[PDB]
Structures are given as structure tokens and as C-alpha cells.
Paper text:
The reconstruction of the [name]/GFRα1/[name] complex reached lower resolution (4.4 Å) due to preferred orientation of particles. The structure of the intact [name] extracellular region in complex with [name] and GFRα1 has been determined at low resolution by negative-stain electron microscopy (EM), showing an overall batwing-like shape in which the two wing-shaped [name] molecules are tethered together by the dimeric [name]/GFRα1 complex in the middle, and suggesting that the CRD is important for the dimerization and activation of [name]. All four complexes show the same batwing-like architecture as shown in the previously reported negative-stain EM structure of the [name]/GRFα1/[name], with the dimeric ligands located at the center connecting the two wings formed together by [name] and the co-receptors. The segments in GFRα1, GFRα2 and GFRα3 corresponding to the helix-loop-helix-loop motif in GFRAL are much shorter and adopt extended loop conformations. As a result, interfaces I in GFRα1/[name], GFRα2/[name] and GFRα3/[name] are much smaller (buried surface areas less than 700 Å2) and likely weaker than that in GFRAL/[name] (buried surface area ~ 1500 Å2). Interfaces II of GFRα1, GFRα2 and GFRα3 with [name] (buried surface areas ~ 730–1010 Å2) however are more extensive than that in GFRAL/[name] (buried surface areas ~ 680 Å2), which may partially compensate for their weaker interfaces I. The D1 domain of the co-receptors is invisible in the 3D reconstructions of GDF15/GFRAL/[name], [name]/GFRα1/[name], and ARTN/GFRα3/[name], suggesting that it is not involved in the binding to either [name] or the ligands in these three complexes. However, there are large differences in the angle between the two wings of the batwing-shaped complexes, which mainly originate from the different conformations of the ligand dimers and their different interfaces with the co-receptors. This angle in the GDF15/GFRAL/[name] complex (~60°) is much more acute than that in the complexes of [name]/GFRα1/[name] (130°), NRTN/GFRα2/[name] (105°) and ARTN/GFRα3/[name] (108°).
Signaling through [name] plays essential regulatory roles in the development of the nervous system and kidney. Glia cell line-derived growth factor ([name]), Neurturin (NRTN), Artemin (ARTN) and Persephin are four ligands that induce dimerization of [name] through assembling 2:2:2 ternary complexes with [name] and the co-receptors [name] receptor-α family proteins (GFRα1–4). Here, we report the cryo-EM structures of four extracellular 2:2:2 ligand/co-receptor/[name] complexes, including GDF15/GFRAL/[name], [name]/GFRα1/[name], NRTN/GFRα2/[name] and ARTN/GFRα3/[name], at near-atomic resolution. The structures show that the extracellular region of [name] adopts a ‘C-clamp’ shape, which is stabilized by extensive inter-domain interactions as well as binding of calcium ion at multiple sites.
Numbering used by the authors:
A (entry chain B), B (entry chain A): 117 to 164, 173 to 210
C (entry chain E), D (entry chain F): 29 to 128, 135 to 207, 211 to 246, 251 to 379, 388 to 445, 449 to 468, 476 to 506, 515 to 546, ...
E (entry chain C), F (entry chain D): 150 to 349
The structure:
Amino acid sequence: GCVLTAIHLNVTDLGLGYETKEELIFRYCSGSCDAAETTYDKILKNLSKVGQACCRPIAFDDDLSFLDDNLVYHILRKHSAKRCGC
Amino acid sequence: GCVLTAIHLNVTDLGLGYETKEELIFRYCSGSCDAAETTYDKILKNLSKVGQACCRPIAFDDDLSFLDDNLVYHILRKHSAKRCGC
Amino acid sequence: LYFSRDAYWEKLYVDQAAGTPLLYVHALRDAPEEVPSFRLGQHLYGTYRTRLHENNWICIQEDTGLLYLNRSLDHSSWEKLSVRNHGFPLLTVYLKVFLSGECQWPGCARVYFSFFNTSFPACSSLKPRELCFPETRPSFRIRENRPPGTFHQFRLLPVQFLCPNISVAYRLLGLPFRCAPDSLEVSTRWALDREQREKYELVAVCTVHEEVVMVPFPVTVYDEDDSAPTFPAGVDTASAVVEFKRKEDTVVATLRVFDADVVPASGELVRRYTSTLLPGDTWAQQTFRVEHWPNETSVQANGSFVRATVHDYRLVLNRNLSISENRTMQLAVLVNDSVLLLHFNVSVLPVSLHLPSTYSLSVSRRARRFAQIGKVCVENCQAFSGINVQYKLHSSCSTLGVVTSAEDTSGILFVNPKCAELHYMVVATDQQTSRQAQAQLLVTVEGCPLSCAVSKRRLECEECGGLGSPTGRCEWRQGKGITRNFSTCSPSTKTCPDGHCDVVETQDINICPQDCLRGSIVGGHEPGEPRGIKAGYGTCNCFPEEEKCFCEP
Amino acid sequence: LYFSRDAYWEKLYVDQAAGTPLLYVHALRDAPEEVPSFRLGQHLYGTYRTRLHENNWICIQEDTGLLYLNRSLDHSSWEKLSVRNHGFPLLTVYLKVFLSGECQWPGCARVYFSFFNTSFPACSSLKPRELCFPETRPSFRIRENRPPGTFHQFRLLPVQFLCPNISVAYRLLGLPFRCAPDSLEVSTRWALDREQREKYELVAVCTVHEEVVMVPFPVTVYDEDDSAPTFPAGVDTASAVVEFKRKEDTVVATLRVFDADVVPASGELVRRYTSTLLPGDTWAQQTFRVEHWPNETSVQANGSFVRATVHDYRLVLNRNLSISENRTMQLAVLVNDSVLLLHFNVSVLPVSLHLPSTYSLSVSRRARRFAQIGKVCVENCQAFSGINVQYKLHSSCSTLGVVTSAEDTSGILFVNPKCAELHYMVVATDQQTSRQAQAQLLVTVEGCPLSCAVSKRRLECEECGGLGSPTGRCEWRQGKGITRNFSTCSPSTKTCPDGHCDVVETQDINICPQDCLRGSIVGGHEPGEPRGIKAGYGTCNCFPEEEKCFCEP
Amino acid sequence: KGNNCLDAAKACNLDDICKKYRSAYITPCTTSVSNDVCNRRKCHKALRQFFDKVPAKHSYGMLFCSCRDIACTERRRQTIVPVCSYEEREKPNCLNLQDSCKTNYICRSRLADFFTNCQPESRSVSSCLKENYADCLLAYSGLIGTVMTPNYIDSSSLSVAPWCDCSNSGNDLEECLKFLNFFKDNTCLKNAIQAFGNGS
Amino acid sequence: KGNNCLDAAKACNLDDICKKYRSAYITPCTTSVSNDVCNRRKCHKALRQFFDKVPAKHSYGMLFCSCRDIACTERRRQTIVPVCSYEEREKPNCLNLQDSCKTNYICRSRLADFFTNCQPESRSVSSCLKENYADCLLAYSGLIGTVMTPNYIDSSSLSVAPWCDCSNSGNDLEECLKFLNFFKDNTCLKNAIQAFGNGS
Ligand SMILES: [Ca+2]
Ligand SMILES: [Ca+2]
Ligand SMILES: [Ca+2]
Ligand SMILES: [Ca+2]
Ligand SMILES: [Ca+2]
Ligand SMILES: [Ca+2]
Ligand SMILES: [Ca+2]
Ligand SMILES: [Ca+2]
């Protein structure tokens, strides 16, 4: 279902506008769930383009930070995950 | 966003196959969210027909149960909601 | 001395005279010596048995049991009482009549009075419907086999006492009931018995002046222990041979006894109908018992459906017998009724433990753990009930394994390097007797999720195997709404999607969950009565590590 | 008596003779009476100052300060020591030279020796580059204004002691430095002063046999307190009038003093350059102080860039002065240097509290609470610094309200039934002096989320109003990457999306959050240095009840 | 058109308190356990807490919905599930059911109430007092959930009965019927049912 | 092609422990507070815990990435943020910086280590012992994060310096330069930098 997957990326590939080239190792949660799992969702499917369950994290990791070109450090809190859930 | 809405229905309109006509008051969660709300979802939108956030509940209510025609009671657990979230 | 009825009805009005007769009473006789004495009560009991005031207005004749006013009735008396009436509308007070606390038959009979706001109405305002009998009908109650006598008198005493100029006549319709002319006492000629007839709803004929009136007349006839136990037309004793079951309890032999009474009712039936076991060997007290429960039935005897009891006696086992018992006895039973003789030929035969020795079977080597292959069965398969025949597998390469299922005491064998023929000397033991046997197996060998229930589609079940497979793969069963024919990718197509949860399926909680999970299925379901599915909607697939299944199309 | 240098270098070899001279030493004179005595140390100190063994091989002449071997050097001695060398390669040991602990100039001078595995090399294996001077160059250190003398001697003593058949000559290049013929002592004729020249990097000329060699020769000249404080060409005393600020501290007047020395360095500058405040009224000690910090500069005096100190003296306020002070004094300062006279004309003038009395303004009646409309200003707007001029609003209908902002001490007025003209007698008070004033306001009146920052688009901000609106609606400001020009639906287009968080914006936490929230913005951001935004990517909208904003395109 | 019973069900289940304690009396009555069909004890406990806590106009509607066709009378009898809660394998004798109620506290409370309340005496107007109807009502519907459970038999009328008969009675038979038809043919209780089913 | 510094950054940030305590020395150095530009004290504390906990081959790579073009030498100087952590408004005198290090425990540890380690004595082979390089390394990079912070000045060479000069010195000037150029022109430390930047 909602499972863990590590990846390599650039902070330029985060694309927040920070002027650097430095990188990171990023761990995300992917894969859909069972799409009903209670009576209430069955009745939501009966009543209705907004809909069923999602994949999210259940906690967050420690920080990720770096230097840009222009003389300045940049910080990131709440950016990548450890454990995944519906 | 994902908000609360009460409704009147029949248990026949639940359509689980129970042989009755008795009813209920059902409270659901409707309305989509802000569709990005993190860098990770921006990069998911960059990479990709499966997609962005949903509307779900955050808890469940107390039980809902009844009688059918044929001499038999029927129970329901986990069927309707109190509070709604992305 | 008992009362022919229980409750008496008569009406009062304002300013009636003293000495104005109300009613006669009647008391029957169980013996000719029985002289009915009569006396009154004291307090006018009101609605919801409220004592109201000392009755000083009324006297009685013991000799006839005649009620008559000594004092007269007036609005000072009837508003003195209607305040005590607790704010309720007044139309009923009553008294007690003892003849030799709470008033009941046969010691007592309560007599009512229904007062009205008006006084005594005139003779022309009285319709002939209410000149013959009062409205609330009597209920006559006679015991059988008594000194026969008189139980009823006709005349409305205020009516003829204050309107005597109307000629009023009363009579009755091979019946012992007769009405005398010139004296309106109702009598019975000879004594009744229930065992011939038991219901007499006759008609009393009234004649006014002109109108003739017909009224009901119910008589209930009682019963006695004038009967001893009796066989049902030449059936004295049955017998059978204790053969196969040997459970802790099983009904063996059954006899019927006809006592023609009803009278020892279902409460004091413990005290009289005792199944006295006549002794013998004390081993029968270890191993047998006599159960006795009645049921009462009706029969035509002289045109009425007279009822009585049927007393059945049963021999039920008392313990789980061993195999090797070979004995015989004759067990006698005395029967009380307040005394018949019964017996039973009871013989115990032992059972041979001869398992079929030579039998062979082929096993696909691709099979997974807990794989159902073959049935080991003793010579009497569907017949043992209280014997623990346990299967031991001595071997002479570990692939197979047997545990006896406690249902059939039969063996469903399971899976617990160039070795494609083996030798399993199957040893068939017992626990309560050390007697075992053994037999020869000549087993011939012929060369994705964890469980099967996680599967969802047809080819998803057929192209992939689970944990308990004797074939390597699982098997899809496929069959209205909330019904026992549901569908699942089940392992054991005669044992998994089945309705029984055996010891093949319950060792580790992955094998066959539809019949053996303890979760909570979401869906249009109906819970399996041990556990699991009794019914489920659409498709039903399971995720057992979360201990949960789902029914959803 | 001080040493012309600090560290001395000479080489040793195996089996050199006793009485073999190593080096002369030199010690300068601060007085002509100063007789340099010389004695040696005791332990051969090794690498990382490790005592190795008692030096018994070497004696000295105090009179010339000549080092020479009393005993000879052999492999029994140099493997006795190289084990004590802690497993490190041996090329450097040293001693101490006291002249009248840790060895330092001018009490001591440490002398090195660089031993080699070979013995003394022959005369033809010595290139004329290493016959003149050793490799590690000397560093000559002379104090100015001394009895001038001799500080250096040329001859390599093992070279001529064991290869005397090579004619070797040494000389030097209006300089007091001279080299005598037939005696190779280097002398200085007259005494030096730093204040004329301070750097002498000359060249000593060596002649072998044929090769002539040129070498460096650095001399550092020191300094004294031969100088008293001095004015910078006719600048004695400044003055100013204490006018507007009246902060706790502000520099008022500034003077420059030139003492031509360097010698009282930055450590003991507290002990000598004391700003002695000459007394007067004690009110100046309540209200003023004299700060003194140096900075050292260089100047051309006779072709070199001779450096000295610059001593500035400043008058800085000591407390928040009141308004009504009207006085004058002449504050004198004595200056020490180990003594100059300074003063300051200091006059305090009071400030009038004449607010402009008659002023009118129009207010749209649709405006919301905390609505910025107009500026109240005292007669000297951008000029007060340490005076708490607080605004009180006496009225004679509650729509408007004023609180003084503590930045400008100016009034930004806010919103806290057929009444469309009012009268607000604006009362301008102070806290430290009871002096107030008052003035006349003739205010003329002319007939969706909670905050503005929750808005997201252009017309979404322009077609809907928030909490702090003077116009009823909000206002969209719209302006690269992580930059201070960001965009928001801000209330106060000169005060909300601004960079300052005033008391207009901070009463209840809904008004202008971009400059005043305390949250944590997600996005390419750069935090506002008090709080809030300094920069944010794309579009930035806020949700203040969760105390959070977002920057996202 | 439906009937009065489904509309009374709409009346109960729309209030969430009636619905929640409805599920309270539902749950142990229909989870079948090993070698039973339900638990009788928990089910009856939960019916008693339903007919004590939740107020009148929801429950007495569904219990006393006036009927005009036959499936109404079915559901009229259905009101407490005979199959788990009222029926058993056997009917005992009615005095046995009376003393087994007499070994129960709350049962004897409801039975003394019913002796008190729906009594058909001499000639008042509708065989009752017409304002002790509710006490009549809180008698019968009071009797629900203890061991003496009344329920309908005659779908075509309003004659209720418990789970016994006057078999095996002997001498007390008529007294049995004096008890038994007291549930079966009461003019006062039938007037109360008709009055509550007309809309009183 | 990049340079050695971005690849050494790839070397550090791929290990998550180097990255986590990287963010530890990042965070208080660049959240600007009211009337400062950062906190110097928390920032230097966090640099010290970074250069104590995380092992060698990540950090000394980025700090000692050998340079061939000018933005490399920029980032070479950039290694500890002068603007918040090394630069201030003023340079004091170097003996003042020495005694202010002498009022600091860990600083004096690193300074006595650097006195011990990268010493350019008489003629060994590469002005060092070549296997006390790491002790040379754990001297200089040891000195990071206390009040005596060395950093680069000459981008075109390897001459490092702290935040002082020999102004206001008077008599101790040359001794000052004896100290000062000890950071600036060390043959042993420059041989160690070249050796670590060739891949030792
Ligand atoms: Ca008889
Ligand atoms: Ca008899
Ligand atoms: Ca008998
Ligand atoms: Ca099964
Ligand atoms: Ca001088
Ligand atoms: Ca001087
Ligand atoms: Ca001086
Ligand atoms: Ca602002």
C-alpha cells in the first residue's frame, strides 16, 4: 500500500528558488490503499469528483540544510519522511 | 475544504442487503483540499492518472443498528463521521 | 365443603328496606357428613382491595346462606365511602365468605355489590332480559365422584321481593342435572366422573309472564388418583445393545407408562413420580441413569377429549465408556404414583480395533505445509462418540503427519532429497484403554501471498498458491445476497469454505480464515456462528495479519 | 642590555676538535654603563622543548660571548640522545643565553645547533654561497635613541678555523651603518630615531677568494614616549547646541589629539590615556560623559611611513533629558600620556510643545477597526529621540482613537448614528515633564474573511475587505525570487507589507501578519529579521488562527 | 404508502439518542456464538436499558403503530425478536413463568405495574380511566425485557401473550386462563392501543 | 565539471548523519533576530558539535577540497560563514584574540594542538612528518568553532588567518607576526593541504 521509497535528488530539483547546486537523499511514501475499508466510505461512494483514501506520512525526519551561492545558509524543517500510512 | 455535512437516509439506501425499511442520520465529509501543500506534491505533479489530496474523516462515531423484517437484528460499527480532514 | 363458584354479583340501590334479601350461597359436599356453615366478613373492600368501613347494614342466614339488609342505604352512607374510594368511580365493592387473609376458593368466596346512584327502579322499567339472571355469568365447579347434591338457586331476590306480580319460571334442559318444579334448586342425581365426560355447557330456560330466555351453564368436572400405572396395550419392556457411540450420555431404551390421572401436576411431579432404580451391580450407577419427563395428551373416552399424562422412561448413559467392555445385565425400575415394575435388557459389546492394514496413496511432491491428502478411518467410521482414538505416526524423511480430528475420530493427514517412496507404520492408539494397533502406509511420491484468502479474482486464485496447499495452488469457490453460498479463494474446497473449523485449519492463523478467523468483516455480512463467515456480500477477501476480512463486490 | 636578535643558528658535525669556536653573541646598550655579561644554559633542549642531557661538551667566553667545544662529538653521544628524541628525526637542538623558565628577548636568547650524520666536510665541498652567511637570515632589533654601538660580527668560525686558506672579505653598502676594514664588526655611528626613519633593509657584501654574494639586512627601530599630546594644527575645542534628540546617549562633540608615540599599546591604554573630566556642576555627571578610543595611522615624515596614534575624545549623553532644560556650561577635560587641556561649550535649549492647533480631515464612514487615516505630528517631527510624548484624545460618538507610535513619536490614528461631524480636542502630553498641550480636530465624516492576508488572487483582494481597513477593502501589493519585493493582499500599503511591525498592527493578531506574524512559512523564504517575511516565493497568503503562512506560486 | 411502523422507525432513528441505545439493544441479540443462537441474558439487559432511558414518542410509536394491513401486524409482533429473545425450544407452564418472574426483581416490578394499570373493571367509559393510559402504557412496554415477555400472536387482532400455555396445569387451569387471557383479551389495553394509534 | 568541493558536498550530504549534524550547525547561524544578524554563540556551539561528532572523509573533503579555479577558492574560504561566524564589525588586536581564546577551554585545547601539530621545523622531507598530517588536520579543523577561528583570505593561495591584525601592537609586533604568519605561511600545513587534496 502506502510504502517507503528512497531517492537521490538535487536541492535545485526541489525548486524552492534557493541559489545552489547541493543535494539530498529523499524518502517518500507511495502507493494507494484498499479504497473502501469502512461502511462510511461505501456510503460516500453511494452518494457521489472528490473521493477515496490517500497515501501520507505518519511522522517526519530530522532537518535538511545547506549553503547557497550568495554567502548565505538555508535551512529546511519538515521535508522528508520515515514511515508511511494511509 | 474537507467539511462536515449531515443528511437523512434510509438503511435501504445504504444498500448492504439488509431486509428492512428503517433509517439513519448520516454525517459525512466533503470538499477538496489545496492540491499541493508541500514540495513533495509539487514534484509528484512534475513527474507524472493517480494524484493529489483527498477528503477523509479523522475519527468515527458510535454504532448504528436496527431490525430487519426477518426476525433478526443487524449491527453496524464504523459507518459515519464526526470530524473531517485532508 | 367447597364452593360451586368463586365470585358472586348482586346490585344495590338507595333506600332499600331492611330484611331485603340479596342472595343465597351454595357449598358442595365431598362427604355426606359435610355441613356447610356460613358467616360473613367485616370490611367493605373497595377498588384495589381497599378496606372502606365496617359493614353494619347487612346480616346473613347461615342455614340458607342468605344475605339481607339489616340497615338501609342512603346518600350519607355512600358519600362517606366514595371519598375513601381514593378518587375513583364507584361501581364495585365486595366482602368475604369463609365457611369453616386472602379470600380464595375452597376456603372462601368473595361476593360483590354494584351500587348505583338511583334508587330501586319500578317494575315496568325492568326488561325481562335482566329479570332472569344477572349479567356476569356464573361458573360452576364440581369435583367428580362426590355425594351428589345442590349447587345453584335461581330467583333474583330483590326482584320478586319488590315486584311479586310477575309470573317467573325457571327450568333446565341422560344427564344427572335436573330442575325440580315448584322448587328452583338445581340438583345432580348421581356422581360424575371426568373419565367419561368432562364438559357440560347446558342451557337454563327462563320464562317471563311474554319472553323466554336461554342462558349459558358451564360445569367443570375435576379428577382424582383413582388410577394406578398401566401399560399401553401390551408393551412392557424394550431392549437394545450398546454398540458404537459410547458418549458420556445417549438415550438407549424408552418405555411409555399410562397413568389415567392428571392430578399430580407439573410442580409436585418430583415428589410422586419417582423413578426408583432397583439395584444390581453398582457399575450401572457408574454408567447408566433413568430419566423421566411427562407430557399430557387428550383422548376420546365417551365423546369428550379427556386428558391425562404420558410418562416416558429413558435409559441415558452416564459416562464415556471404554472400548473393551463385554457384559450384560437386567436393570429393573419401580414406578410410583401417589406402583409398576419395569426392567431393561442391557448388554455391552466391545469394538475391534482392526484398522485396515494395507493401503497406499500418491502425494504430489509440490504440496505445501498442512496439506490435506487422505482419510485414515477405523472400521466403524461415523459411529464413535466418546472414545479418544488418537493417531500416532511411527516412521521408518519427514514429509507427512497425522492428527486425529476430534469430530469423526478420523485422520486427515498433513505436511509438517531422492526419497520418493516411504514407510509410515500408522499406529492407532487410545487414551482410556492402552489398546493400540498399527497398519502399513505405502506412500508413493510422484516427483504471491502467504494465505489463499488474500486473493481477489478468479485467475488470481488459480495462478497462485498459498500456505495449505496439497496441490501447490489454492482453489476458487464461486457461488445470492447475504447467503451461505459466498465466494472465496479457499485452500480446502471441502474443508475451508465450509462451515467447520477443524484442527487442520487452526494451528497457525493463516490457513483457512473464512471458516476460522476472529476479526470483523466489513460488508453485508452475517456472522459465522462459531466465528468467521456465515454469509457475505459480493466478493470476500482477507488480510489476516491485521485480523480482518472484507466483503465487497 | 638587550639582544640585537633572538635566535641563533650554527651547525655541528662529528669529531670536531675541542676549542673549536661556534659563534659570537651581541648585546646592545640602553646606557653606556651597560656591560653585557654572558653565560650559558645547561640542558640541550630538544624537539618540542625536551630536555635531553647535560651539555658538558661546550664552554663560552663571556667577554666576547664565544661558544666553543670543550669536548668532542661522537656517535656514542649522538645515539645516546636520538633515543631520547622520542622517535623523531634529529636536526635541531638548542640552549638558552641569559645575560644578567622560558627564554625570551631581552632577558634571554636561545641558540640553535643543527647536527648532521656526516663529519666536517672538506674545503672544496663548500660552495661560496654557504661560506659567507648561514641560511636562516638574522633579524636585527635596535631601540631608537641609545648609546650607538656594535651588534653583529661576520665570520663563520668553523669555516676559517678549519679552512683558513681562502681569502674571505665582508663589507656593507648618509647612513650611520658602517663596516670597518680589517675588523668585521658592524657598527652604527650616531643614535637612530623612529620619527625620521624606521625601516633599514640594507645589503652586506661578501667576497670569496671567485664569487661576490649579496644578502639581506633588516633592522627594526623602536620608539619611546619622547612626545606629549599635541593639537592637529590649530584645532583646540568644538561646540554644539543640544537641540532635538535627547536620547539616553548621543555623541555631541568630537576632538582629535595627536600624541606622536605608539608605545602605550592597546592593552595598557586604560592605565595612561585617561580622560580626566575636570569638574563643574554635578548635573553634567548625570547627563554627559567623555568617551576615548584610539586608532593608529601612518604618515610620511622622512620618506618612511611612520605610524602613531590618533586619540579622539567624544561627548556622549548619559540619560534621557527632559524637554524644558535651558542651561549652559563649559566642560573641561585633562588628557594624560605616560598632559593637555581641553574644554567644550555645551548649551541645552528647551523645545516648544506647540502642536498645530487647527487641522481637519475627512474619514470614510465605511472603514473598519484599526484604520490608519492621518498623521498627528509635533512641530519637530523626525527629531525627538528620548522623550515620551504620549497622545491623549479628549472628546466632546466613539469612532476614532490615537496612540503615539514609539518610533517617530507621531500619531497614527485608528478606529476603535447621525453624528457626521465631531470635535476631538487632541491633548499632547509627556510623561517625564507634566507639560501638555491641546489642539482642535475638526473631523469631517462623509456618509469574506477576517484578515486581508488570507486572500490569494488580485480581484479576490480588491473585491473583499478584511479587519484593518480605512477604505472598507484591503489592497493588493504585487512585486524576483527570494526577494524583499514580495506580493500580498495587505491592509496598510505603506505600513503592512513594509518591514516594520508597529503598535497599529500588533494589538490583536489578525491585522497585518506579513510584517507581524510569528509562525513558520513554508516556501522559498528568508525570515524577517524581527519576524515575518523578509523574502518569500511566488504568492504568499496567510492563515493566522493556525499561526502559519505559505509562500507558493 | 408504508404504514405507521416505518414512519415510527423514522421517528426513532432520526433522534440519535434513540438510535444509539437502539444499537445497544441490538448488538448481543444477533451475534451468534458457539452452540447457541444468541445470548438471551445480555440481549434482555440491553432491551431493558433501551426501554428505561429513551423517551416515549419514538419507541411506543414503533411498538404501538396502529395497523391496517398484514405486514404491519407482522412487524407489530416483531417488535422484540421472538426468535432470540422471546421464543425458546419449549413453552413452560404459565405459573412456572410467573414464579420465574417472581425470582426476578425488575420483572416483578413490571408485573405488579401491569396488575395495577390496564385493569378492565366495571362501567367506566372506555373500560379505563383514559388518563391512566400512559401508566397502562408504561405497564406493558414496561414488561419488555424481563423474563416475562409479552408479544403478539393474533396478527388480525391485538391479543398478546407470553411464552407459555395452560398445559400441565391440573387444578389451577382456569386461574391460569384468568391470568392468561388477561394478556390476551383486555378491553382497557386494547382501548389504550387504539387511542395511542389514533394519535393521542 | 564542478570541482572537488561540490563532490565533497555530495560525499557529506549522502550520509544522513553528516547531513543531520550539518543542519545542527546550520540552524542558529542564519535565523536573524532583532537588532543582530544571527547568534554567534549558538552557531559556534553547533559548529563544534559538528566537527566533533561526524567522521573525517566527509567534512575534511569540503573543508580541504583542492582548488583549480576561483569559485572553488571562494567556497574554500566560505567554509564556516565569515559573515555570521567569523567576521564582525571590527578586527581586534591578535594578542587580544589570543587571550580571549585563553579564557575559553576548548579553544585553548585546539590552539595548543595547532602549536603542537603543523610545525614547520628543520629539514625533514615535506617540512612535516607526513603521518602526523591527520594530527595536523585535527589541529586546524580542530580550531573551527571556537573563538579563534581561522579562515582563508588569499583565494589564490592557501594562506589562512583569523580576524585580527597586528595593528595597535607596539612592542610585540614581530612576535605578533611570528604568531600571525604561522597561520599564513606554513610549509607543513600547505603540504598537508596539498597531500589531502591529491587523495591521501
Ligand atoms: Ca375419576
Ligand atoms: Ca380421579
Ligand atoms: Ca395415578
Ligand atoms: Ca473450514
Ligand atoms: Ca623617538
Ligand atoms: Ca620615542
Ligand atoms: Ca606620548
Ligand atoms: Ca507592517
